[PDB]
């Protein structure tokens, strides 16, 4: 009954659909993916012309998501690649289009790291979430 480690690509494509399903349906609940040492960034520019910084931990991630204005978010996933990494982790690379409150779709580049939770089988958490729009950066 001893198993193989789960397929990285399948793990990655099912997480990415859950992630973007929740962002549209109840983004007050995105915080549930994240742990104590989880990094999060979702685009943004500062006072200078310069990309905005990461926040750390559940409660900081939650208020950060809340302060963004996720209303009837629409997503198109153009690219998903996933590979085993350290400690039976999965690294996921995503490129797509995102629109908030039915404004224009903007192109994006994202990287996730999923860590085993270790409790049940097939149970993961998001250790890292790096999301950047292409316009704010290029």
């Amino acid at each position: 009954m001893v198993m193989e480690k789960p397929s990285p690509l399948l793990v990655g494509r099912e997480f990415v659909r859950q992630y973007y399903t929740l962002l549209n349906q109840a983004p007050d609940m995105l915080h549930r993916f994240y742990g104590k040492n989880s990094s999060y960034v979702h685009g943004g520019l500062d006072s200078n012309g310069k990309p905005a910084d990461a926040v750390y931990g559940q409660k900081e991630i939650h208020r950060k998501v809340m302060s963004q204005n996720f209303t009837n978010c629409h997503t198109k996933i153009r690219h998903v690649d996933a590979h085993a990494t350290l400690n039976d982790g999965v690294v996921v690379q995503v490129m797509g289009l995102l629109s908030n409150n039915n404004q224009a779709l903007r192109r994006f580049m994202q990287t996730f790291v999923l860590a085993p939770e270790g409790s049940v089988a097939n149970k993961f958490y998001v250790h890292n979430d790096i999301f950047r729009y292409q316009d704010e950066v290029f």
């Binding site: 099912e14 399903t21 929740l22 993961f124 998001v126």
Partner: peptide, 18 residues
């Protein structure tokens, strides 16, 4: 939905992810 990805009770899962 074969994989679980955060802290969610059973219904929360079958509201959002089924």
């Amino acid at each position: 939905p074969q994989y679980i990805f955060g802290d969610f009770s059973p219904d929360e899962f079958n509201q959002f992810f089924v």
